[PDB]
Amino acid sequence: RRRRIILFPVPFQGHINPILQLANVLYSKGFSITIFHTNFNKPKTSNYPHFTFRFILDNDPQDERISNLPTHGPLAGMRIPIINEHGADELRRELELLMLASEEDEEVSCLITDALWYFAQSVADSLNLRRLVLMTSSLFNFHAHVSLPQFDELGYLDPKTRLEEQASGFPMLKVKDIKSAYSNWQILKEILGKMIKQTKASSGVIWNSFKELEESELETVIREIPAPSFLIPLPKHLTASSSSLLDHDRTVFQWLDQQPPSSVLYVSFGSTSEVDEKDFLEIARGLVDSKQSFLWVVRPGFVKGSTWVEPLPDGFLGERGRIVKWVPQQEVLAHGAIGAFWTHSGWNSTLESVCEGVPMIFSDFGLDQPLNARYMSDVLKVGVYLENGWERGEIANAIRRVMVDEEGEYIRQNARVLKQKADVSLMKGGSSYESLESLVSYISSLL
Ligand SMILES: O=c1ccn([C@@H]2O[C@H](COP(=O)(O)OP(=O)(O)O)[C@@H](O)[C@H]2O)c(=O)[nH]1
């Protein structure tokens, strides 16, 4: 192959997934693929015989800052600022030796990194290597981020109570959404600033989205980011099953085959989300009160003070519920049994659900999640946002609204229609197809 692309993921599930979907889409367009990855949280390389992996940054000589960090929880993510602050020299050496050791008929066209690797911009620049960025969060989230200076001056960033009102200058959000999203503003201000700055300075931004999903946000991206933006809905191309870091339960499909069509609520609150025991029990009570069948992925550590789901009484989630640890999520969402998805509103999950035409119930645990929940619930109207905590009646009502009630037909139909828009976008002539054609041509032009 004439042209090689190097991709550099953030080594967590929500970041490795999109970047290896992208790598596949690019391989299909005729690029060879090298993945630069930490040893930490590496995917299964035997799932990718067509890719070359090069492991970097935490190899066994290994700096003292990255040694001793836990492999899971919230502290595992301290690898990100550490690598941003200390990885530049090594990333440069690794890139250069690959650029030099390439064939006569082969060239390295570009580096694609996660947006959180803001340090890679200065490194790629120093090699005259073009860096493109993969955003793993939505265009709307970005639009909210660049509106922070106006939120600050309106005094929405102070923990003042105008919580239920539309935000002035940003009518799609309520003040509470902004409060929730930017609950650690003063803390994360500097690092978020760096990610934005270096994304703006990149050679192109690939968004895991499609035009017809976030059409209100496209002008912001054209205005605020001088580099070209490309929108590709990765889950429409292929699922992320090959980049799973955990063993799929898979016995779920036998259970799903015993369920009537559209009768199952899929429930998953996210990789690092945490609840008090009180709220965990309130969620379970909500699920039982809904009377719907459910498949609930609970990650160990979801319930504060418990290893897994110990506070649940025996048989409390009777015949119609199943709790598992891990599934091939998009494949589950594609299964005919699934009627809805109660999500924490992480962007991959949200987008997978959209691409599978599954309507949603939204909870959030901050960051971009309340913004995704607000946009999907109030703008697209493909789900119901439980935006006032956890209360069994409200939960049960939301589940039933989406899965059963005639009054929620609009939500179900909107989800079907939005899937169709995603499918159309991929076909020759569609917005994503053309965005991908432009990306391929753009990358091929960079030399
Ligand atoms: O049981 C599971 C739960 C999650 N996922 C995948 O893990 C990723 C989670 O990303 P997301 O952005 O939704 O949120 P995070 O969990 O990173 O907060 C998605 O691609 C899901 O499809 C999965 O394959 N199986």
Side-chain angles (χ1 to χ4, degrees), residues 12-15 17-18 21 136 235 240-241 243-249 266-273 296-299 324-333 341 343-352 367-369 372:
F12 295 94
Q13 194 74 76
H15 296 263
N17 283 1
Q21 289 165 306
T136 61
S241 175
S243 56
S244 183
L245 305 181
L246 301 166
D247 294 330
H248 291 138
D249 188 304
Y266 174 63
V267 183
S268 178
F269 294 112
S271 298
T272 59
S273 307
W296 184 7
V297 171
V298 183
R299 300 299 302 133
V324 299
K325 296 196 171 157
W326 195 251
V327 303
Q329 171 169 291
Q330 193 177 343
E331 291 84 346
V332 165
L333 290 167
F341 176 18
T343 181
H344 74 311
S345 321
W347 188 244
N348 296 286
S349 290
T350 300
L351 187 67
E352 286 154 21
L367 302 160
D368 61 311
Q369 291 157 31
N372 300 335

Side-chain angles (χ1 to χ4, degrees), residues 112 259 400-401:
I112 304 173
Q259 310 306 320
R400 291 178 70 79
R401 178 172 182 82

Side-chain angles (χ1 to χ4, degrees), residues 55-328:
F55 294 102
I56 63 166
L57 297 162
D58 67 348
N59 286 310
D60 289 27
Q62 212 159 206
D63 195 27
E64 74 200 309
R65 296 195 198 76
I66 212 170
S67 300
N68 211 39
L69 297 172
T71 60
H72 62 118
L75 292 319
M78 283 188 296
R79 283 174 182 77
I80 295 163
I82 288 163
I83 285 167
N84 272 298
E85 289 170 36
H86 300 288
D89 296 345
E90 178 173 352
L91 180 64
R92 194 178 195 264
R93 286 192 292 274
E94 289 290 337
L95 292 165
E96 205 173 73
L97 84 91
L98 200 161
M99 286 161 84
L100 270 48
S102 69
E103 308 305 329
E104 295 179 305
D105 53 13
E106 186 204 302
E107 299 282 335
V108 181
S109 290
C110 68
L111 169 66
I112 304 173
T113 78
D114 197 286
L116 287 170
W117 294 141
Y118 64 78
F119 84 109
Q121 189 58 52
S122 188
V123 173
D125 287 346
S126 77
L127 298 169
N128 197 26
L129 182 64
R130 302 288 74 75
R131 174 175 168 263
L132 280 77
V133 166
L134 180 63
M135 302 295 295
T136 61
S137 55
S138 73
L139 282 76
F140 182 62
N141 181 63
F142 172 83
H143 188 189
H145 279 329
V146 302
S147 305
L148 266 152
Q150 300 91 284
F151 299 150
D152 186 287
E153 298 300 330
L154 285 157
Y156 301 150
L157 278 299
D158 189 69
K160 298 200 180 155
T161 307
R162 191 84 104 76
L163 303 176
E164 291 294 302
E165 307 290 59
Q166 274 209 323
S168 63
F170 211 104
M172 293 189 164
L173 295 180
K174 300 184 188 184
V175 178
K176 67 198 262 183
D177 311 328
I178 295 162
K179 282 244 175 298
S180 171
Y182 304 116
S183 193
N184 295 324
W185 161 237
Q186 83 290 35
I187 298 165
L188 274 52
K189 168 172 168 70
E190 196 187 312
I191 292 171
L192 176 67
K194 288 175 171 162
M195 160 167 48
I196 295 284
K197 180 170 188 74
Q198 298 312 325
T199 297
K200 289 182 180 193
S202 76
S203 294
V205 186
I206 301 161
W207 297 85
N208 188 15
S209 196
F210 60 104
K211 169 164 161 215
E212 297 78 15
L213 192 65
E214 301 198 85
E215 195 165 1
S216 55
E217 309 307 310
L218 304 176
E219 176 53 271
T220 293
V221 162
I222 296 164
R223 184 188 50 254
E224 296 291 336
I225 294 165
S229 283
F230 307 90
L231 280 68
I232 301 170
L234 296 165
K236 286 274 67 157
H237 283 273
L238 69 172
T239 78
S241 175
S242 297
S243 56
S244 183
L245 305 181
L246 301 166
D247 294 330
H248 291 138
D249 188 304
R250 288 216 135 242
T251 77
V252 300
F253 289 102
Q254 290 88 340
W255 181 83
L256 290 167
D257 279 352
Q258 301 176 315
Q259 310 306 320
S262 302
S263 70
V264 176
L265 180 66
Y266 174 63
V267 183
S268 178
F269 294 112
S271 298
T272 59
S273 307
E274 187 189 298
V275 289
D276 302 320
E277 192 180 317
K278 184 193 79 199
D279 294 333
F280 174 64
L281 295 180
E282 199 66 11
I283 292 161
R285 288 186 200 94
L287 291 166
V288 174
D289 291 352
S290 77
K291 307 181 193 291
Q292 304 310 300
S293 301
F294 61 90
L295 173 54
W296 184 7
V297 171
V298 183
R299 300 299 302 133
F302 179 58
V303 190
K304 194 190 170 177
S306 298
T307 297
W308 192 32
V309 298
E310 287 80 357
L312 287 170
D314 172 81
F316 193 71
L317 312 177
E319 271 179 349
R320 70 201 64 170
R322 265 201 61 155
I323 288 187
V324 299
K325 296 196 171 157
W326 195 251
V327 303

